[PDB]
Amino acid sequence: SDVPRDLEVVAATPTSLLISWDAPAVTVRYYRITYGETGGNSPVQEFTVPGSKSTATISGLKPGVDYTITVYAVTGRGDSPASSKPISINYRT
Amino acid sequence: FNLDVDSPAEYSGPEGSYFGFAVDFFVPSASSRMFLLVGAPKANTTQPGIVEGGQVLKCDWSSTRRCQPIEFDATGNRDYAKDDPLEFKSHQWFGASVRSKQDKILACAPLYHWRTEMKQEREPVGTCFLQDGTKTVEYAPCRSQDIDADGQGFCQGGFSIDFTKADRVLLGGPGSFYWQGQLISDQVAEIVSKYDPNVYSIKYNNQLATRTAQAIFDDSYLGYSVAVGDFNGDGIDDFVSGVPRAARTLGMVYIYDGKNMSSLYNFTGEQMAAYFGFSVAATDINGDDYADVFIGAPLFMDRGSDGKLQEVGQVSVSLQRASGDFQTTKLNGFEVFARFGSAIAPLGDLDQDGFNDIAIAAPYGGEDKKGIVYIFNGRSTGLNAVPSQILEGQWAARSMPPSFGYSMKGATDIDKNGYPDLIVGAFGVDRAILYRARPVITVNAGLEVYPSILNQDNKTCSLPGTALKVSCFNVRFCLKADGKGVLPRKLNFQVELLLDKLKQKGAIRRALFLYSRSPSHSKNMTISRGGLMQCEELIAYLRDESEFRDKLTPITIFMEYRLDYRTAADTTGLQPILNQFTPANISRQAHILLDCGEDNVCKPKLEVSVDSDQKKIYIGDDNPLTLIVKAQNQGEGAYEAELIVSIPLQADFIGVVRNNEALARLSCAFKTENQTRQVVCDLGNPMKAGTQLLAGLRFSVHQQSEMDTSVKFDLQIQSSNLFDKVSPVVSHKVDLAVLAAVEIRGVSSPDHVFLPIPNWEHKENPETEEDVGPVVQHIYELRNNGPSSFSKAMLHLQWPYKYNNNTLLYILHYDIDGPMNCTSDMEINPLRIKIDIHTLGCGVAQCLKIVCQVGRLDRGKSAILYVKSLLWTETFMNKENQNHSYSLKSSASFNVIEFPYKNLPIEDITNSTLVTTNVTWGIQ
Amino acid sequence: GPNICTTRGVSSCQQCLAVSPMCAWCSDEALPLGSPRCDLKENLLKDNCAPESIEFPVSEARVLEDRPLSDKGSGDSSQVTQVSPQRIALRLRPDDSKNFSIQVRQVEDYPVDIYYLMDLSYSMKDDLWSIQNLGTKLATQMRKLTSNLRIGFGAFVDKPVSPYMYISPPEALENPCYDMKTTCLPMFGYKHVLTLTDQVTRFNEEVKKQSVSRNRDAPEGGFDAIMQATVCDEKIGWRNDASHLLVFTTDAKTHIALDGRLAGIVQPNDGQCHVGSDNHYSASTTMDYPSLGLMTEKLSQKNINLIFAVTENVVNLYQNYSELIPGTTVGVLSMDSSNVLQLIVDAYGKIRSKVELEVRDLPEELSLSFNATCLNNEVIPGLKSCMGLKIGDTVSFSIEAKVRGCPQEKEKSFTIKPVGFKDSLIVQVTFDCDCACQAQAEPNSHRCNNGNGTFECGVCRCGPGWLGSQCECSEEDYRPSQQDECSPREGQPVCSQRGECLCGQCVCHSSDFGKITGKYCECDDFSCVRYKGEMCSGHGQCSCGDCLCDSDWTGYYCNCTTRTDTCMSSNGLLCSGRGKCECGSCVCIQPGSYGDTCEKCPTCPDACTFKKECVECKKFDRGALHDENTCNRYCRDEIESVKELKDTGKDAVNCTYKNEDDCVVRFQYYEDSSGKSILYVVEEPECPKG
Ligand SMILES: *[C@@H]1O[C@H](CO)[C@@H](O[C@@H]2O[C@H](CO)[C@@H](O[C@@H]3O[C@H](CO[C@@H]4O[C@H](CO)[C@@H](O[C@H]5O[C@H](CO)[C@@H](O)[C@H](O)[C@@H]5O)[C@H](O)[C@@H]4O)[C@@H](O)[C@H](O[C@H]4O[C@H](CO)[C@@H](O)[C@H](O)[C@@H]4O)[C@@H]3O)[C@H](O)[C@H]2NC(C)=O)[C@H](O)[C@H]1NC(C)=O
Ligand SMILES: *[C@@H]1O[C@H](CO)[C@@H](O[C@@H]2O[C@H](CO)[C@@H](O[C@@H]3O[C@H](CO)[C@@H](O)[C@H](O[C@H]4O[C@H](CO)[C@@H](O)[C@H](O)[C@@H]4O)[C@@H]3O)[C@H](O)[C@H]2NC(C)=O)[C@H](O)[C@H]1NC(C)=O
Ligand SMILES: *[C@@H]1O[C@H](CO)[C@@H](O[C@@H]2O[C@H](CO)[C@@H](O[C@@H]3O[C@H](CO)[C@@H](O)[C@H](O[C@H]4O[C@H](CO)[C@@H](O)[C@H](O)[C@@H]4O)[C@@H]3O)[C@H](O)[C@H]2NC(C)=O)[C@H](O)[C@H]1NC(C)=O
Ligand SMILES: *[C@@H]1O[C@H](CO)[C@@H](O[C@@H]2O[C@H](CO)[C@@H](O)[C@H](O)[C@H]2NC(C)=O)[C@H](O)[C@H]1NC(C)=O
Ligand SMILES: *[C@@H]1O[C@H](CO)[C@@H](O[C@@H]2O[C@H](CO)[C@@H](O)[C@H](O)[C@H]2NC(C)=O)[C@H](O)[C@H]1NC(C)=O
Ligand SMILES: *[C@@H]1O[C@H](CO)[C@@H](O[C@@H]2O[C@H](CO)[C@@H](O)[C@H](O)[C@H]2NC(C)=O)[C@H](O)[C@H]1NC(C)=O
Ligand SMILES: *[C@@H]1O[C@H](CO)[C@@H](O[C@@H]2O[C@H](CO)[C@@H](O)[C@H](O)[C@H]2NC(C)=O)[C@H](O)[C@H]1NC(C)=O
Ligand SMILES: *[C@@H]1O[C@H](CO)[C@@H](O)[C@H](O)[C@H]1NC(C)=O
Ligand SMILES: *[C@@H]1O[C@H](CO)[C@@H](O)[C@H](O)[C@H]1NC(C)=O
Ligand SMILES: *[C@@H]1O[C@H](CO)[C@@H](O)[C@H](O)[C@H]1NC(C)=O
Ligand SMILES: [Mn+2]
Ligand SMILES: [Mn+2]
Ligand SMILES: [Mn+2]
Ligand SMILES: [Mn+2]
Ligand SMILES: [Mn+2]
Ligand SMILES: [Mn+2]
Ligand SMILES: [Mn+2]
């Protein structure tokens, strides 16, 4: 019905990343990008990007450590959670 | 104050119908008659299969207090299919909002439900009905192809409605777009002309409506209440709507242009959950022709005397000015849980004072939740905040609170008495009450006593019953009566005269009327119009010298008038009331001749002296200015002597000095009238010869604009004597001084740095703070304390940049708080950045100087300079004598170069301070 | 010589009792005249005049019931006593004041009642993980502070009416989830589920059964549940002499009062208990949401503490809501960090970290003053509350009670209690106004002289127009027959001008805008001192040119305020510890400090300079904060010694200094992560060698 996914990886440099996905097909206020190390490791950081753009960009320099990302599409009005479901990828540096 | 509470008009609908939930006036253009419109949203109807459909009744004021329902729909709902109701009139609350302009009336059903045309549902779009005499059209803007909660499906349009002077309907609804709310406006003529009974969603041309917004604005409840008025240059009313759940429940009031829906102005509540914007109103209360805003917050909580939180409700009063910037004042409720700001109703100008007046109701206040309505008169200064009258509804409680208030409509003259009347609805008891205003007669009275100085031995006129010579005088008193609106041609007053009112209280009666032989006399009088003052001549004599101990006490003639009320033919009865602030009586004093000399007339020599006491008063502060006055009478006795102290402008009276034994406790009063504010003090009645008095008078002087140089006081003694009745005019001034205490403070964070430094690796080409050293931050504050203010000042910083070609404290970036610009003689961050004890000052090292321009630091405000620097670790150790105690001394100087007040002698203000950062070694 | 008593109250007995509390009265008509009867203290003892006939009521404050403060919250105690004393009898003569004291103690092992209000709306299906465990885990971290605690819970969704609920096709009535191709439960108002009991197994079993319902209106209106769980004592099972905790959880914002008008609900919340035997809110459809004020009022009446446990997004909202309902705390609900386990105990710690006295049924005629002794006889004045407390601490309050006149009453009563506790101090109020021998008067005429006269205990005064020592006055007035010293000295004119002096007793009414009285009529009662456009600032009466200020007002102009609330800072300490509160506005006393709460201090010692005193206090046991025994009270910041490790770094302040031992101590502290004072001190500082 309504959800993120079709998650690609477009631009690759020695560091950072670029992530692109497909729209949830419903009106979206914005998105929330969440990422962290694999396993049961340290808590995850999150930022925000607008809803009219299908891309995102993040900075920083870290090794791979089996990195995995998540992106939160926040759509909710009325009594319901403002999200659909987290989806993810797995990529290494 | 002119509303008549003894005999109002009471209208009652069927119980349980919420009769009185909405009220308005019906004044048709086709008839000279007027009617009361009362909404009853829970009333049962003859409509087939409709339970509690609601209705609006037309109540006749003429007689019988009979109310008849106005027929709008009278039909069932509709059908989408065989058994598929296309709408639901059951419990639709029709009549919950009723408004009427001229011959047009508009009633709405905010709980009307739809099902739309796509899928089975029940969506409270709401609907209205507009009817002019014969034809009835249905108006449902929120009923459209935009559905569900995302669209207008839950809008409940018709929750609040209003008309403009251009015959344009303003209609709000809270439920549009997930309860963001919406305002929709349409031309009345466009509504009727475009109405097609076979089309459920009607597109209207020239429709002004707000659109959906971001979901952050959801659950705002825009359109909970609406009002109309013009706040821009055009004459066309602009839209005003309270939105109580907006701004994270603080509450807001939106103002939109009448031309297009563009936003104009905003208001915001200062307290959460207070429901700021539950009720709104627009009137001009100061008579300045600019409409002024009234916002209700019935759930607002102020703080009592003990400081605890308590819900009294609050009403916001915003006065529109020429520029458009509102000057807003707030007033609070009185009883807790009374919900003071529940209903704000403009009643027009009730008193005909020339300024409109307004009514505010607390429906759950009063005696045991009966309800109460406060009315407030407006004036030139804006709305005066005190009830000039209280309307306390008296009705029992059956099921729910008999809410007196919660529904009001004023600003219409139903009795044609020339005075607007007021309707207060009470849906708890299913009743509506109509209060009628009163003509407000303003009576001007005067009293003059003949030969006010009585000669004991002048026995001229005597006719007391086989006369014997006695001292006589005449008492003349005149009476003027005039008013506005309809009121009888002639009025009847009852006058009461009392002689020597000071006496007769356990004391001898010192004066009698000639014919009556009594201290008191009364007479019935009749006046017609203004300037028609009718007087009467009575002769009152003075009893024989041996009949009493005489007195120096004056004989006070006391006149009091009554004006018994028989007026207002038919219409039960309507009693005109006197003016709000009017004297109920007047007094005038006569004196017995004593020690006036061989001339038989007392001619006093009055002189008033004054000493400077404090020579200086400073500009920005409030000062304890005390004036010592010397009042002397070197002549014969002066009757009714008074000390006149003229205090101009900023000066306001405090009191008299009771603590001093050398000074007098003389009673003084602060009197303002005839565009003149001043202080009056009793010097004695009479003030006897050779009297000398000393008393101090405390005041507080702030300022008037600026550069007024000194301030002038005017002192004069005056008396009621026929000759030499005044002293000269002695004026005393005190110079205003400029004193502003300015201090300069500084700190260093940290105070010290302990070498060696953890994780230190010297890099040939430094990159970040990690490659340079720790962060030393100097903060300098220039604060103005003293009462005065300075317009411009300079600030000089001396930074120890380098010592022997190597950097000591490397400055990265400096910020400024307050009105200050700064400049560095050396470039900050030349290399850029990412993010015994030996004293080192700028004198003994290389100086990086920072010069700052400062301006306009008032009494409270100050200016700050934050300097963030890195300690240069590479400089230390080495041949720098590794183990040595270094203190890094930065100096900061300030000088005040200008002041805003001119023509006032000034003195320069200068001072310095130093900030030290001590870098030392914990291990040697 | 002449005093305040002999210049006013010579008219009568009862009128003499109200001049000053020092005044007295003389009965026993033996040897009349020769002196004023209204004189004070031993001046009437100078003359013999000392039978039981002497009238000198003395204001008393006597302890009726004072039980000793309890130690533990077990059942073998007296009953349980957190307030000493309990009952005090107060007797007051007009315009007099007597003072008393009260001790309040937070007692250990005090039983705790916890009732859970859970949002079952569809937005809470994501946050429903927190309801699991609970009663099993709820107990574990509560076992430290309190044995014998009882838990229970109830649920709320929204009002089952207009838009809030789904009136859509009938299959959505039974199953509000038809759209979204899922099935959920039908919605309801507040629903009581489990009464407070002992068994945690009964709790967890009943808790897991709970599922989510659906409504379309984003605010869920849990205030309906809060109001009912507070006012319904039997259904909830709130105990007495036990801490009452009402914990509130929701995914999103809430309805407030007057929101129900959209649903067609015009009836205000009555604050009564409408929960029936079916455990449902009957009036949920019929009456509006409760206002904050009514919630605040009923919350304190039942001594119930409200706790907000909400999602991180909506935390700041309910955090701001809590400020309007004093005594309520907010906490973050998240799957990481502390969460429910250490959350509630911290919230219960905050509630017990403050002691403030609330006054119920205080009569209008008298006012109360409070000096607070919290930390080792610090006697902080003007404050009725003590902050920064732990369970087991005891605080003291000195209270002054002053009545203005007396409204000829029999007895009244008011209660002084700490907020959130059953233990209370009841004060019985009685006023001594009438003379004891006033009742002995036989009311009829002819009792004094020539018939047609008045009388009292040791008093004869004739009637109007007669008005004499026995009976005679003006309308003859003879010669003055004396000056009667109508002035304090004979070289002065008639008594206070104002209608001269007649026939002995000076008569001067003049009827002009008030009442004028006195022996010489020196008391105007209208002419007084004014501050700004009003007499005594409208906050006080006027007696003989003096202002008697109303309750919560002091000063010569009566423009000074008792309130310390506007002096309180964001941290909760008045004037941020940088100044002292005077007349409702802080007067900052510190170098470079200013602001309303003295919160602004750009140039002053920063960070460590304050906290390095606390580490010497706590960790090194070294003084200058350990000398005044203010260590545990002032800085409650937890100090965890870290081994050699200053971490990679977060928002932090790295601080070093040299101690008495000439060793360099390095430490740092984290800022708020959900809020805390956490402080890390590096072990093994740097010292010289040898
Ligand atoms: C009294 O208080 C009122 C309540 O606060 C004030 O009303 C508010 O004024 C705001 C300022 O004008 C206004 O914010 C503007 O919103 C419009 C909405 O148009 C949009 O059109 C797009 C349709 O898809 C979407 O835009 C994108 O951006 C949003 C985030 O905003 C994304 O979430 C979307 O996915 C989408 O990609 C929106 O859905 C929306 O429908 C915006 O166009 C405005 O943009 C302005 O700022 C940007 C820079 O950020 C500029 O580039 C641009 O040129 C505009 O200047 C604003 O964001 C609120 O909507 C409005 N709310 C209400 C309820 O009226 C009122 O102004 C105030 N009056 C006074 C006198 O104080
Ligand atoms: C407009 O007309 C409508 C309908 O004509 C009318 O609504 C009706 O109101 C009555 C009473 O207010 C309702 O009758 C009730 O029915 C329920 C069962 O559904 C009963 O439980 C009610 O109470 C009874 O039982 C109690 C014991 O449990 C007794 O104590 C009590 O005395 C009763 O015996 C009650 O009988 C009726 O259902 C509605 N009809 C509807 C809603 O269609 C409304 O009052 C009218 N309003 C006005 C302003 O005229
Ligand atoms: C002894 O006492 C007698 C009274 O007991 C006294 O006779 C009074 O004399 C005064 C003046 O000497 C009279 O007052 C004036 O009388 C003239 C007569 O025409 C009036 O015109 C005057 O009118 C004034 O007031 C009007 C307003 O009402 C004004 O419009 C007008 O312009 C004047 O200002 C004024 O009344 C008074 O009337 C008599 N009284 C009697 C009862 O005759 C006598 O003078 C005393 N002896 C001595 C030596 O003074
Ligand atoms: C909305 O109505 C107002 C007045 O009727 C107009 O607002 C003008 O907007 C233009 C934008 O180009 C400004 O240059 C003018 O100064 C505004 N006039 C005002 C504020 O009085 C405008 O005609 C309408 N349309 C809008 C604002 O989009
Ligand atoms: C006569 O008029 C005076 C003033 O016009 C009134 O007496 C009092 O006036 C003050 C204002 O200065 C009011 O505050 C009081 O309420 C007034 N007293 C009363 C009893 O009304 C009053 O109208 C008249 N007073 C007398 C004694 O007749
Ligand atoms: C500069 O500020 C200082 C305060 O730092 C003030 O001087 C004080 O008073 C006298 C001067 O009248 C000095 O001798 C004292 O040492 C100062 N008191 C201190 C430092 O506590 C004054 O406002 C200014 N003084 C000068 C000389 O400009
Ligand atoms: C609070 O502390 C003050 C200490 O100043 C106590 O005593 C008052 O002190 C001054 C006179 O020096 C005045 O405010 C009062 O006259 C004093 N009160 C008396 C004598 O009762 C004050 O009593 C303390 N308050 C309480 C309730 O204990
Ligand atoms: C600082 O400079 C700006 C222009 O660069 C000027 O507008 C402002 O008034 C200046 N402020 C002061 C305090 O001089
Ligand atoms: C009243 O004054 C102080 C209040 O702390 C106290 O020392 C004194 O004992 C009090 N008096 C009585 C009778 O309690
Ligand atoms: C909470 O209140 C503070 C000030 O009291 C305000 O700055 C903030 O925006 C508010 N936020 C919310 C979510 O209520
Ligand atoms: Mn929800
Ligand atoms: Mn306009
Ligand atoms: Mn105006
Ligand atoms: Mn009228
Ligand atoms: Mn003379
Ligand atoms: Mn959730
Ligand atoms: Mn809801």
C-alpha closest to that of C282 among C235, C249, C247: C235
The answer to whether the CB atoms of A80 and C123 lie below 8 A apart is yes
| Total count of domains within chain C | 6
Residue B704: CB atoms within 10 Å = 11
Q: Which two tokens stand for residue C113?
A: 């009642």
The rounded distance, in Å, linking the Cα atoms of A23 and A1 is 11
Q: List Cα–Cα distances, B362 to B101, B338, B343, B375, B388, in angstroms.
A: 27, 5, 8, 11, 16
Residue C186 DSSP code? P
Residue B217 DSSP code? G
C-alpha closest to that of B401 among C266, C465, C188, C501: C266
Q: Tell whether C399 and C439 lie within a shared domain.
A: no
Chains that touch A (3 or more CB pairs under 8 A): B, C
C-alpha closest to that of C223 among C185, C268, C262: C268
Assign residue C242 the CATH number of its domain. Answer: 3.40.50.410
Residue of A77, A79, A83 with shortest CB distance to C122: A79
Which residue does chain C place closest to B92, by CA atoms? Answer: C264
Whether C371 is in the pocket of ligand 7, judged by its Cβ within 6 Å, is yes
Q: Tell whether C577 and C499 lie within a shared domain.
A: no
Q: Are B46 and B71 in contact (CB under 8 A)?
A: no
Ranges of beta strands (E only) in C338-454 are 355-360, 366-373, 380-381, 385-386, 394-403, 412-418, 425-431
Helix, strand, or coil (residue B98): strand
Q: Which two tokens stand for residue C115?
A: 């009732």
Helix, strand, or coil (residue B143): coil
The rounded distance, in Å, linking the Cα atoms of C254 and C211 is 20
What type of residue is B920?
A: T
Q: Tell whether C630 and C684 lie within a shared domain.
A: yes
What type of residue is A71?
A: V
In this structure, the residue with its CA closest to atom 11 of ligand 9 is C99
Q: Is B877 exposed, middle or buried (0-12, 13-18, 19+ CB in 10 A)?
A: middle
Residues of C in contact with B149 (CB under 8 A): 163, 216
Q: How many CB pairs under 8 A join A and C?
A: 25
As beta bridge partners, residue B792 has B855, B898
Whether C97 is in the pocket of ligand 7, judged by its Cβ within 6 Å, is no
Q: Which two tokens stand for residue A59?
A: 């900075």
Q: Is C105 exposed, middle or buried (0-12, 13-18, 19+ CB in 10 A)?
A: buried
State the best of C223, C291, C513 to mutate against chain B, taking most chain B CBs within 10 Å: C291
Spacing, Cα C629 to ligand 7 middle (Å):
26
Task: Give the number of the atom of ligand 7 that is nearest the alpha carbon of residue C369.
Answer: 27
Tell how strand B730-737 and strand B616-618 pair up.
Answer: parallel
The rounded distance, in Å, linking the Cα atoms of C73 and C198 is 17
Q: Tell whether C453 and C572 lie within a shared domain.
A: no
Residue C517 DSSP code? B
Which residue does chain C place closest to A43, by CA atoms? Answer: C336
Spacing, Cα A71 to ligand 10 middle (Å):
28
Q: Tell whether C266 and C334 lie within a shared domain.
A: yes
The rounded distance, in Å, linking the Cα atoms of C241 and B377 is 54
Radius of gyration of chain A (CA): 14
The rounded distance, in Å, linking the Cα atoms of B208 and B201 is 16
Q: Are C450 and C463 in contact (CB under 8 A)?
A: no
Q: List Cα–Cα distances, B328 to B166, B248, B377, B836, in angstroms.
A: 28, 22, 17, 64
Which residue does chain A place closest to C313, by CA atoms? Answer: A82
The rounded distance, in Å, linking the Cα atoms of C399 and C380 is 12
Spacing, Cα B162 to ligand 12 middle (Å):
15
Name residues contacting ligand 9 (CB within 6 A): C 99-100, 398
The rounded distance, in Å, linking the Cα atoms of C14 and B258 is 71
Which residue does chain C place closest to B774, by CA atoms? Answer: C654
Q: Which two tokens stand for residue C224?
A: 């309906």
Residues 6+ apart with CB under 8 A from B642: B680, B681, B682, B683, B717, B718, B719
DSSP assignment of B234-251 = SSS-EEEEEETTTTTTTB
Residues of B in contact with A79 (CB under 8 A): none
Residue C343 DSSP code? H
Residue C526: CB atoms within 10 Å = 14
**What strands, in cross-sheet order, belong to the sheet with B652-656?**
B606-611, B625-633, B691-700, B652-656
Residue of B305, B501, B507 with shortest CB distance to C552: B305
Q: Which two tokens stand for residue B465?
A: 């019953």
Q: Tell whether C471 and C520 lie within a shared domain.
A: no
The rounded distance, in Å, linking the Cα atoms of C572 and C578 is 13
Which one of C443, C475, C507 terminates a domain?
A: C475
First to last CA, chain A: 33
Q: Which ligand is nearest to the CA of C382?
A: 7
Q: Tell whether C312 and C427 lie within a shared domain.
A: no
Spacing, Cα B866 to ligand 8 middle (Å):
18
Residues of C in contact with A76 (CB under 8 A): 123
The rounded distance, in Å, linking the Cα atoms of B93 and B111 is 6
| Residue C135 phi, psi (nearest 5) | -40, -35
Q: Tell whether C518 and C662 lie within a shared domain.
A: no
The rounded distance, in Å, linking the Cα atoms of B537 and B447 is 11
Q: Is A73 exposed, middle or buried (0-12, 13-18, 19+ CB in 10 A)?
A: buried
The answer to whether the CB atoms of A29 and B215 lie below 8 A apart is yes
B51: contact with A, CB 8 A cutoff: no
Q: Tell whether C192 and C329 lie within a shared domain.
A: yes
Residue of C122, C252, C336 with shortest CB distance to A43: C336
Q: Which ligand is nearest to the CA of B579?
A: 5
Q: Tell whether C82 and C122 lie within a shared domain.
A: no
Residue keyed to tokens 């701004």: B247
| Residue C548 phi, psi (nearest 5) | -110, 100
Query: Which long-range contacts link C23-28 to residues 24+ away (Cβ below 8 Å)?
Result: C24/C54, C24/C55, C24/C56, C25/C54, C25/C55, C25/C56, C25/C435, C25/C458, C26/C53, C26/C54, C26/C55, C26/C458, C27/C51, C27/C53, C27/C54, C27/C55, C27/C437, C27/C457, C27/C458, C28/C53, C28/C54, C28/C458
The answer to whether the CB atoms of A79 and C126 lie below 8 A apart is no
Tell how strand C97-105 and strand C83-84 pair up.
Answer: antiparallel
Top CATH class of A1-93 equals mainly beta
Q: Tell whether C300 and C190 lie within a shared domain.
A: yes
Q: Are B401 and B363 in contact (CB under 8 A)?
A: yes
Q: Is C165 exposed, middle or buried (0-12, 13-18, 19+ CB in 10 A)?
A: buried
Q: How many CB pairs under 8 A join B and C?
A: 197
DSSP assignment of B724-753 = S-B---EEEEEEEE----EEEEEEEESSEE
Among B821, B822, B894, B897, which is best to mutate for testing ligand 8, by the most ligand atoms less than 8 A from CB? B821
Q: Residues of chain C whose C-beta is under 8 A from some C-beta in A?
A: 121-123, 125-126, 158, 214-218, 220, 251-252, 336
What chain B holds in terms of domains, given with CATH numbers, is: 1-438 (2.130.10.130), 439-599 (2.60.40.1460), 600-739 (2.60.40.1510), 740-924 (2.60.40.1530)
The rounded distance, in Å, linking the Cα atoms of C497 and B686 is 12
Q: Which ligand is nearest to the CA of C401?
A: 7
**Which residue range is the domain that position C499 belongs to?**
476-562
First to last CA, chain B: 89
Task: Give the number of the atom of ligand 1 that is nearest the alpha carbon of residue A27.
Answer: 35
Name residues contacting ligand 8 (CB within 6 A): B 819-821, 853, 855
In this structure, the residue with its CA closest to atom 11 of ligand 5 is C513
Which residue does chain C place closest to A84, by CA atoms? Answer: C126
- ∠B172-B178-B184 over CA atoms, to 5°? 20
Q: Which two tokens stand for residue C382?
A: 């003007």
Helix, strand, or coil (residue B647): coil
* Residue B700 CA, distance from chain mean position: 24
Q: Cα distance from C252 to chain A (closest Cα, Å)? A: 8
What type of residue is B566?
A: R
Residues 6+ apart with CB under 8 A from C294: B311, B337, C227, C257, C269, C271
Q: Cis before residue B750, ω within 30 degrees of 0?
A: yes
Spacing, Cα B544 to ligand 6 middle (Å):
79
Helix, strand, or coil (residue B581): coil
Whether C381 is in the pocket of ligand 7, judged by its Cβ within 6 Å, is yes
Which residue does chain B place closest to A76, by CA atoms? Answer: B215
Whether B436 is in the pocket of ligand 2, judged by its Cβ within 6 Å, is no
Which residues of B make up each annotated binding site? 230, 232, 234, 236, 238, 284, 286, 288, 290, 292, 349, 351, 353, 355, 357, 413, 415, 417, 419, 421
DSSP assignment of chain A = -------EE----SS-EEEE----SS---EEEEEEE-STT-S--EEEEEESS-SEEEE------SS-EEEEEEE---SSS-S----EEEE---
Residue of B111, B507, B924 with shortest CB distance to C502: B507
Give the DSSP H/E element, type plus range, for residue B496. strand B491-499
What is the CB-side half-sphere exposure of residue C381 using CA atoms within 13 A? 7
The rounded distance, in Å, linking the Cα atoms of A83 and C1 is 88
The rounded distance, in Å, linking the Cα atoms of A77 and A75 is 7
The answer to whether the CB atoms of C163 and B400 lie below 8 A apart is no
The rounded distance, in Å, linking the Cα atoms of B40 and B23 is 10
Name residues contacting ligand 10 (CB within 6 A): B 248; C 316-317, 320
Q: List Cα–Cα distances, B872 to B598, B699, B798, B802, in angstroms.
A: 102, 60, 18, 10
A78: contact with C, CB 8 A cutoff: yes
Which one of C550, C583, C604 terminates a domain?
A: C604
As beta bridge partners, residue B392 has B372
Residues of C in contact with A78 (CB under 8 A): 216-218
Q: Tell whether C485 and C377 lie within a shared domain.
A: no
Q: Cis before residue C85, ω within 30 degrees of 0?
A: yes
The rounded distance, in Å, linking the Cα atoms of B284 and B288 is 7
